[PDB]
């Protein structure tokens, strides 16, 4: 009872796109921005390009990104098979939501924060429909297309469940993981809900570091001792109670992604009741409008 993944993997000519700038660099490789002009099409699509034996890793990320299609999940546009392997995706001009929430903290309203909480829950709920566990949900891994539209990205750690994933050992983001993921290395859709709670806490604190000034090894014990992240200042008890529910030790008593949509959507209908913030070329086609079946 496992469905065939009939997603299409589009191979892109190196001619079809040009690089423009370097958006970011890390070990493996650098992420760049550029334009993609499919030959004989008269369209220019703003894209972001990301170019060992780690090719097995980047090709696993491409498989996952090519198999998702949701307004709040970044989809792979294609890959380029030159001397280096490149991943081409739609350009998210405003960067990651973590940096955006930091560089604009004096201009972000409750309506935007709660809407972001709704959109991330919508994208996370879609990944659960597709039986996909992200395992690395964080504010740094949510990209901003427009201030009103954010999407989930970075599926390097994502794993597809059959019809409870048991990792072995890898550089993992300790401070965002559920307690069972720390101790047993078990990952469930409800393990992503814990990460979702930390991600919401990142937004409501305008980019603060969770457990700032704490060793990563001491985290497993303080979570057993009953300790969680503090109530952010702008957070009513209503919003903070939801974040606390995502961090319960019993994983099945945690909120579901389908329910986090409903609760935050109800809150976005009256944002100031739940968040208290002081003073509330020519042929360019966005990739969300370029659809080839
Ligand atoms: C906040 C953390 C941080 O330092 N960075 C994250 C955002 C980067 O800037 C931009 C990145 C992208 C990406 N990234 C991307 C991720 C996975 C894959 Cl496979 C591919 Cl191909 C990617 F391109 N995607 C789309 N748009 C942007 C836009 C960015 O800034 C404008 C820099 C480092």
UniProtKB/Swiss-Prot annotation:
Changing residue 24 to D: Found in a lung cancer sample. Phosphorylated on Tyr residues in response to EGF. Dephosphorylation by PTPRJ prevents endocytosis and stabilizes the receptor at the plasma membrane. Dephosphorylated by PTPN1 and PTPN2. One of its GO terms (molecular function) is double-stranded DNA binding. Residues 17-275 form the Protein kinase domain. Binding of the ligand triggers homo- and/or heterodimerization of the receptor triggering its autophosphorylation. Heterodimer with ERBB2. Forms a complex with CCDC88A/GIV (via SH2-like regions) and GNAI3 which leads to enhanced EGFR signaling and triggering of cell migration; binding to CCDC88A requires autophosphorylation of the EGFR C-terminal region, and ligand stimulation is required for recruitment of GNAI3 to the complex. Interacts with ERRFI1; inhibits dimerization of the kinase domain and autophosphorylation. Part of a complex with ERBB2 and either PIK3C2A or PIK3C2B. Belongs to the protein kinase superfamily. Tyr protein kinase family. EGF receptor subfamily. This is Epidermal growth factor receptor. It comes from Homo sapiens.
